[PDB]
Write a protein that binds this ligand. Structure first.
Ligand SMILES: [Cl-]
Ligand SMILES: [Cl-]
Length: 162
């Protein structure tokens, strides 16, 4: 198991524009296109991302390319973030993937906001962090996914994904 396989299970890989859990236009493995209600705006953003007139449909390779870019950007966002970097540096390889997953889903700013959970993770207080992580909109809105990531932080294993 690795970060790509993990996110692929969590996000899937749709080749046609679709709406995410929040109702926003997205494509591929969770690649948000726009928060605007306009399909046209979405198609515009898509064509600009891919560099061709797509008509709302992309190929698998194109989807994977967006995926690779997005994982890369999440990692780099963490590394540049003053609140996130120290946490990431303190964790083992499995837990690092879990932090990447949250950043991928909610953005650096969003995760950087889990102040208390981050401190707990840094201190290696696993069960405490897991409880704190669950007290959030994130957990209430996407419980199954959140449970998988939390278990990953709690155990340091990939059991939730196997
Ligand atoms: Cl892009
Ligand atoms: Cl879920």
């Amino acid at each position: 198991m690795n970060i790509f396989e993990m996110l692929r299970i969590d996000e899937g890989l749709r080749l046609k524009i679709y709406k995410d859990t929040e109702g926003y236009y997205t494509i591929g493995a969770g690649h948000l296109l726009t928060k605007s209600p306009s399909l046209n705006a979405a198609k515009s953003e898509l064509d600009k991302a891919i560099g061709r007139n797509t008509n709302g449909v992309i190929t698998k390779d194109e989807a994977e390319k967006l995926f690779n870019q997005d994982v890369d950007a999440a990692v780099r966002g963490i590394l540049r973030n003053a609140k996130l970097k120290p946490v990431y540096d303190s964790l083992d390889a499995v837990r690092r993937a879990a932090l990447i997953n949250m950043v991928f889903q909610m953005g650096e700013t969003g995760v950087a906001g889990f102040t208390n959970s981050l401190r707990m993770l840094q201190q290696k207080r696993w069960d405490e962090a897991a409880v704190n992580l669950a007290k959030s909109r994130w957990y209430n809105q996407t419980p199954n996914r959140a449970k998988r990531v939390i278990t990953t932080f709690r155990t340091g294993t990939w059991d939730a994904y196997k």
